[PDB]
Amino acid sequence: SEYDRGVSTFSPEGRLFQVEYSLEAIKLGSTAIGIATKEGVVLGVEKRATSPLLESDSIEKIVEIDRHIGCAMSGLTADARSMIEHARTAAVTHNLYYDEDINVESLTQSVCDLALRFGEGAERLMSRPFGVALLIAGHDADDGYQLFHAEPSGTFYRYNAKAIGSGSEGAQAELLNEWHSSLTLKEAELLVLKILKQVMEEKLDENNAQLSCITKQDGFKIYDNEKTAELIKELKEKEAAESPEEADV
Amino acid sequence: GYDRHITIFSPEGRLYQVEYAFKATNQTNINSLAVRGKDCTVVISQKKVPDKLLDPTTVSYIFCISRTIGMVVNGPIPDARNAALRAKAEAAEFRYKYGYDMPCDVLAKRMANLSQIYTQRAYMRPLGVILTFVSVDEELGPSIYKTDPAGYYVGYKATATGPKQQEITTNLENHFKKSKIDHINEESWEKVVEFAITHMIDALGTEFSKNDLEVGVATKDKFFTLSAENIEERLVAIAEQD
Amino acid sequence: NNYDGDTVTFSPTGRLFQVEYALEAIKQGSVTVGLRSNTHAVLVALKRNADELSSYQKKIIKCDEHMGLSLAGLAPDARVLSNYLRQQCNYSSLVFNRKLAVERAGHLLCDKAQKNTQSYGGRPYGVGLLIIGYDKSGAHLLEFQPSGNVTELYGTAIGARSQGAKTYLERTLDTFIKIDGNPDELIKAGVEAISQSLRDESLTVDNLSIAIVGKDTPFTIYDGEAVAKYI
Amino acid sequence: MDIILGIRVQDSVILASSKAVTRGISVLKDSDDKTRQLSPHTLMSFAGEAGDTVQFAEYIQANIQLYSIREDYELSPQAVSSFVRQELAKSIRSRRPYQVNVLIGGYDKKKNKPELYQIDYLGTKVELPYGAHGYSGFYTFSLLDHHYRPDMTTEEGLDLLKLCVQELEKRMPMDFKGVIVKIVDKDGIRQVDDF
Amino acid sequence: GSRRYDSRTTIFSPEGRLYQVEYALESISHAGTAIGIMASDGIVLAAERKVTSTLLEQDTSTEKLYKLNDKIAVAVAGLTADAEILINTARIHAQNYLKTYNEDIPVEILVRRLSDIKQGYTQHGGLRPFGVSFIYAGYDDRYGYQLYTSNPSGNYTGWKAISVGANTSAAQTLLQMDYKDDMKVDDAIELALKTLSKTTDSSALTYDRLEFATIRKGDGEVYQKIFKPQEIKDILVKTGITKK
Amino acid sequence: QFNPYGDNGGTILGIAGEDFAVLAGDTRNITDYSINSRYEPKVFDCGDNIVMSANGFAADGDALVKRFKNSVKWYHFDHNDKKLSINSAARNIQHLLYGKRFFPYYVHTII
Amino acid sequence: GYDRALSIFSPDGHIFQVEYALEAVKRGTCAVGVKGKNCVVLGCERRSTLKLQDTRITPSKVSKIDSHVVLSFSGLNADSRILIEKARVEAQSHRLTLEDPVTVEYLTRYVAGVQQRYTQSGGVRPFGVSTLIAGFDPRDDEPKLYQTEPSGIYSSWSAQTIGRNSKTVREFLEKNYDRKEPPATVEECVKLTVRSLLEVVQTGAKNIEITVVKPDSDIVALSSEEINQYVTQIEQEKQEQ
Amino acid sequence: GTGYDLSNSVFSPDGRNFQVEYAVKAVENGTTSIGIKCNDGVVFAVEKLITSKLLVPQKNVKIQVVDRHIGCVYSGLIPDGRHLVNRGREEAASFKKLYKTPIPIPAFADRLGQYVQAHTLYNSVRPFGVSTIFGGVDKNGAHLYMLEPSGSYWGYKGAATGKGRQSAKAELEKLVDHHPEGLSAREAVKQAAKIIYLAHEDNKEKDFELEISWCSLSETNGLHKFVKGDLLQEAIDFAQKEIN
Amino acid sequence: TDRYSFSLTTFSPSGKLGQIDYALTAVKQGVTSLGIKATNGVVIATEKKSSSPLAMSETLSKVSLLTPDIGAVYSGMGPDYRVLVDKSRKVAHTSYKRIYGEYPPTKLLVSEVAKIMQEATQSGGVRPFGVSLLIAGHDEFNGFSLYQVDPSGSYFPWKATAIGKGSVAAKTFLEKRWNDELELEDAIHIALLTLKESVEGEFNGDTIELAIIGDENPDLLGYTGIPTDKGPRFRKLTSQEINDRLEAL
């Protein structure tokens, strides 16, 4: 009875069918990990190219909403184009209306408002909710550096560190263990790289992964492949040099 | 399949919702009969008020559409009042747009075309009601025209509708088969009312008190529903006859 | 089985199932308690986090300088209903220079929810609301269910373990109804009420939200360290 | 107003358009190309109300280019003229009509013949050997009617247009700051280096 | 509510096929046979009336060959009424092109317009597709003579000789067997008549069960001739199919 | 014909200091050569340390003041509780005024 | 008025209409695109080889959106014409509002957005078409090749095939396409393209149709004779073993 | 066949609309409400079940006023009843605006009936889930009506709906038999309180609060007013004395 | 709120249009009605079967006038025939008379009714018309014509035909009895004989409807003074005329 019930139907457990199914679709998506620290917010994504003949540069899963707001996507990335467009337009429109930068939470809420705009009847809406989750990172003078997880359920959460996609379950477990309130920016980059390499089906290099950061000074900067490669080599040298031991016990 | 839920043809070429509306028309367990006099038209309907908590003056299935057209409905009172309001509005709009009062057969054709629209379109169901309009049309004389949930409408010398309609019809038929005419040859409408009540008593085989009948009379310039006391007077006149 | 596909289906027993599923969505939500005296009205809510790296979902929304509500269930539906309530209060204040009555707000919310539970397409709301306010009639606490049923109470609670807080408020009814002119004591009573509904959990600065309204006290929200004095 | 002239010589169409755009008491520009290449073998010169001219010309240009891309074929000059006339006729009775006059010069490759069309802001299209929009005609025609021969070469047409431009520079109360001249023939559309 | 009664005409099968498109093609397979053949100096359309009766007024009957334009005609296979709707729309589009550009409509533009209409009916609206297949025979000064075909799927293609309707496999085999690029219009007439007489489900091929049309060149002007019953009987008795 | 505009007179003045601002206005409301009121204030406090006056057509002035107060209310509602900066308020008032570009608020505005 | 939600999510997380449109793409004719050092080559296979067809008027698989950008497709031709029309209209509108022709990436993004909208609108099924968009940006000599799928995903490719037997051609390309040394000359690119197509067409050269795009709007479709020359040259090496 | 009870406005082979009857079932699950027509007005009464003592008494009103003279009380799905009362208020406003005189009770009854009957006409809307007893005083005196989810409405001497509808109907029959001359307004109020107390036994599971309103030409000057204070306590005491 | 925007008549895997075939069956289960074309007019006829002798059969017209020179009879669902006759009378004026100042020709009016019925078969939320129409008309350029219109929206010109229950046998009687040199009275006689074959009850001028598109009747024009304007061609035969031709037999 998939196409035999309403698209806004509630499950007997008190949930929306299409929302949970879109969450499953997101679980079938690529990995995206964000870490927020007092020095900036870092976003890393797995490009997950289908064939070696695909030019990995054209896998733009980290986009710029505004100079102070960046966004990473995980899931059906085609659905995320309209959301990114709405976010950019809303940010610049708030700038035009109030001669100031839009708050991170305000942008995230404006994006989430589109999530549950699905159903039948009528102006019309959409057929289905979005099949992609977003890590919206940014900085404002009010709440400093912020990272938000935006789901197709219209709900958004402020994470100190959040992983979404396929390898999120393990990645989140790593994040909860690897994050602290004194983490630095380079430390966050290295942690994102390490957890991505752990959860990625492929061997992590500068071509199947992409890093980006949001700083109060320089804004939203997407790391070019050379800087990401240098950070990957730095992390490999740091991990190859760790010396624990439990041979005694 | 679903050809029995919406107004689409079944494999046999039948519309089942129409037939079920026809069946629903008899939900009231009430019979109605209409006959034509020499210059009038009479309708008689059974009045059944089961609950004693009911205001007996609000239990009616005969409606005054215009000052000339009356309509007796066989079917549930929601759809009955729906059709009544629609017919009143149609008659008023006709009078406004065309300058003369809407004839009986014209209103019947309009309601039957609406029923046909319900028969063809799926988003609206047919009304489980049978509508008998009666009047004294200025061009046609005493006029009885009936419509059904299938969109069919036609005029009658006399007609009957309800559970026992066939019986009543046969009775009426017999009388006309004996009279060789198409109306009741009586000048006064009171005697035509008495005739209708007498033949309904004959057909149904039940005795009616003054609170068991509704009488609607259409004369050349009026349509009016009789009071309980006028019905009692007619019943007394019937009881005095042989 | 059947009769649960739409909100336009009545079921043979006369039960609207989608509405009951929304009520279940509320039941699976977080804990929020409301209680009022003659002078004040307090909402105490237990916020819930996805994990230890996530924030705690805000459960109390300010609708106007004299009225607010706490949510339990779908946060988007709560936002929609609170925005409609803000719009109605704004219309009352601008077109009539008049603070919107809490009872009239409840009636409007009821009709707004019922409009969704009678027409094809569109789902009933999936959140329960507890509205506190202080109008010209005094302090008011309302409980709104997406069935369209709104009821005024001295105190109540909705969500998980709501029966414990409800029974505590029933026992403490004669106590809190007389806590007039003392905000902090009514807040402590609400904290005790919501504590009567915790299982294997403890109220912390991060998971507790408080809201206060009343005479000479506009609808104010307390989160974080602001609730540390009540823990 | 602006000077829009056109002549049809044998196997060519020559279009002359004033280089001056003046708004108020100041000549804003002395190097304005009042033409739009609708297709490789069809050019359109325009003049009239400020703004409406360039807008209408670029709209027609976009439509013709889209047609040429869709069908992989260049529309005949007659078809383009009929299209522009229908557009202007729809415009005249719109809310804010277009007040633009156009000369279309093309070379029909199917017929290998030059064609010149004059259309006004009302949608009045005519195919004429020589045409002009505005007060320009009021002078130029008198010359052309005398000095025009159907078998004229492109250089002869250029000399005739030079005589017309001289008469305009003599007996006109305005300085249109010269004319840009363009030739449309079987080999396409070229611009005279200096006139 | 009404969702339980929606047939969902514009949906894909798990294999990636349009259900209603396939079913409409199956419907057209049972319709009469229409054949178009494009020779070097003309085009010929020949169609078979599937339903035939002794009382059918064939003089005023036109169920297979319709005039879209003085230069373009169509042979229809399938539901006559849907075809007539599409024919009215095509005539209107052709006259609009003529009014806009003062030039007669090119064949491919009209064919593509009708095919795009069909496609729109197969992608949105939730309506049933038109159960009609068209064979366009047209002439314009760009591509000369042109033969096109369009089906309910919204796809259109060009052919030297093509057949739609019933027994398309055997008809196409016979045409491919006997067709030559250099043949003339009369040879195309003979080929179409022989293919119909060899692919007809009826007892014999007679004039009453046939519609015929020729777009020729006879002056530098094209003539679109819809054959009358007597002309059809004459060409039949001439080609040796029937005896007189 | 109906003139949808009127003049209520009045005069307002705004001076900016080093760590302060002052916005003053006369309390007189008039119509033609008659006085409507001697105390109808025109300098309103809108919160967030933003005082505003719209002198001219009193109806348009009241309308604009109410709209700006509503805008600051909805700004607080939609953006947590961030204070409306004076430049942000100025831009919002510019948009409020330009909304009726073809039916202007017949008022000179000073905040 | 018909707003029936046709593209909806399945319990496992799939959109079955999008996947069935992809299956419709699989049933379509094969198309391939290869990026050279100074050119892009688009090849397309034709359904068998029928002699009753009119090859001069039948729409070819490679259609020009602008003088510098072309689009081939695999899937439903009817659904492809709509995308081609929208793309040409948008190219002209972008020229009209920007005074600069569209970039290949921009046109590809527009087509992908149209398809994504068609995967999320009521009463509308997704396109049963997958497209390859090839060209050169204005005043730029770098080759551009992109692929769009019915789901709305678009991505750049050094070389890519879509349609029936696309797995085989993609294997062939991953084997024979050196990203370090792309086909320098146009002849090398056409040769690699024709070998990729011949590994699947199995029939004659009439099935293969080739178009080559070079900067500054230099787009030309190869005649059947050149295709026959290429197939004969490649087969001559096949005898060499 | 089967499945006729899954879509509104679908006639079963009997001739019934099962969704309407299911809405009637939902009504029967509601509390008890009654109306009593006296000689110069009408009296409405309803029981409000005290789910918890946390409910504020005398609040959560169940009787709604329409115009200034009409009273309405609904048993069943309270929100649907509120929707119906809002629609009736809109109808009354329209009637008074066009026709100076306030809307008569029969006109208002017919308006509500047509609204509900329209709600029984389409599969896109569910029938109403409240039986509404309403009425008041117009230029023709007192009127008391009851409207069912089927759109069927009637004028009553006394009406009752809800869980305790049967005992209330029996008591109303007793009052109609023992008082042919008609009851007075205050006596009707006390008798309505008694009938509510007697009908509470059917749903005696929880304690209840009595709510009474009345519209009387002499006692309220023809305006709908809520019975409060001394009259409410007197009716409550009368009922409590009758119970024990 | 007509949510029935989707088509109710769709193609089955067998290629058959379900509702079309079902409407054809409903037509086959209707009372027989026939038409015969002659050299100086056309005849249409049908049986006027009433439900009760109390019902007035004359008040129900099975042969209706579309234009002064075009009439129609039916077989199938009476209400569909009435609404189609109203729609046809309106379309004759709106889409012809008000544009060309003359009454439409038979072919074009038949085409308009066929378009209406086809739209009924294809539009959303509608069932095909459960009727088959026999339309007999006369225009100046095409002369007399007789057309049959089926629920599918198709129409065919007939020299003579019939529809309804006893249609097939009736058609055979027409095939053996028809000729291309028939007068109007001969066609009336043949129609009466075929209908008598197709009727079970009483067969008199009160149980049969029969109309003719014959000569011009200026006595029915209603005005005199315009020589160019002649009387209508449509004439419904009176009960007396039918009974006279039956007494002849």
XYZ file of C-alpha atoms in Angstrom, chain E residues 6 8 10-18 38 112 115-116 119 122-126 143 145 147-148 153-156 158-161 172 175-176 179, chain G residues 2 4 6 16-17 19-21 23-25 27 49-59 76-79 81-82 88 118 123-128:
74
model
C -6.570 6.772 -10.108
C -1.904 6.499 -12.913
C 1.946 8.292 -16.589
C 3.978 5.754 -14.625
C 6.961 3.593 -15.522
C 7.053 -0.170 -15.354
C 9.956 -1.688 -13.376
C 11.526 -2.283 -16.791
C 11.231 1.382 -17.801
C 8.179 1.293 -20.064
C 5.018 3.390 -20.195
C 7.688 8.114 -50.762
C 7.307 17.376 -33.968
C 4.642 14.363 -31.142
C 5.389 16.820 -28.326
C 4.660 13.259 -25.097
C 2.479 10.668 -21.652
C 4.376 12.512 -18.897
C 1.895 14.683 -16.994
C -1.801 15.351 -16.537
C -2.798 11.853 -15.439
C 13.580 18.595 -47.694
C 8.986 15.194 -50.085
C 7.239 10.771 -44.905
C 7.010 10.705 -41.105
C 4.678 7.275 -27.221
C 5.391 10.760 -28.587
C 8.284 9.496 -30.725
C 8.393 10.344 -34.433
C 11.181 9.415 -40.940
C 10.843 6.655 -43.529
C 10.988 5.987 -47.248
C 8.084 3.551 -46.856
C 7.145 -3.976 -43.590
C 7.871 -3.265 -48.532
C 11.542 -3.807 -47.669
C 11.134 -1.085 -52.426
C -3.676 16.676 -11.252
C -0.802 13.038 -7.698
C 4.099 9.875 -8.369
C 11.070 3.752 -7.684
C 9.968 6.105 -10.471
C 14.989 3.995 -10.864
C 12.440 2.874 -13.459
C 13.326 5.921 -15.564
C 15.852 1.362 -16.467
C 14.160 3.084 -19.411
C 17.533 4.731 -20.046
C 16.819 0.183 -22.806
C 20.172 -0.878 -39.786
C 16.854 -0.543 -41.626
C 16.791 0.439 -45.284
C 13.180 1.663 -45.284
C 14.153 4.500 -42.916
C 14.830 8.043 -44.137
C 18.222 8.962 -42.669
C 18.177 12.576 -43.911
C 15.170 13.740 -41.867
C 15.103 11.434 -38.824
C 16.343 13.428 -35.797
C 12.981 8.054 -24.519
C 13.326 10.342 -27.542
C 10.017 12.057 -26.757
C 11.201 13.014 -23.272
C 12.923 16.677 -27.150
C 11.417 18.541 -24.174
C 17.911 25.892 -26.189
C 10.519 16.564 -12.495
C 1.293 14.632 -11.465
C 4.689 14.403 -13.180
C 6.991 11.423 -13.779
C 10.777 11.829 -14.057
C 12.464 11.913 -17.444
C 13.368 8.560 -18.949
